[PDB]
């Protein structure tokens with residue numbers, strides 16, 4: 206696997222045309238505060254094609 | 256007045272746009288900037 210190629214799987218809102226959001230900061234899907242640490246419903250926003 | 260800052264959060268975690276008149280010149284940058292807490296230029 207080549208893991209160097211990444212895509213965003215999680216965002217709070219959809220991009221407008223040519224919006225270029227590079228931010229890697231940890232997302233919150235849950236009603237409970239994720240405090241910037243990884244977990245269930247507290248996902249890292251990118252994924253790798255491998 | 257010598258420049259402008261634009262963006263969403265202005266705290267490096269997402270990108271920001273800086274525009275400055277450097278006396279004769281004009282400069283534009285987009286970066287993961289962390290600014291100082293009270294932005295101004297010492298002259």
Ligand SMILES: *[C@@H]1O[C@H](CO)[C@@H](O)[C@H](O)[C@H]1NC(C)=O
Pocket residue numbers: 218219220221224263
């Ligand atoms: C632009 O960034 C702000 C940051 O709070 C966000 O609310 C907004 O949804 C973003 N725009 C789009 C189209 O994603």
Ligand SMILES: *[C@@H]1O[C@H](CO)[C@@H](O)[C@H](O)[C@H]1NC(C)=O
Pocket residue numbers: 277278279280281282
């Ligand atoms: C800023 O302005 C001075 C004016 O003498 C110039 O020498 C310098 O190259 C400029 N630098 C930038 C990054 O604009």
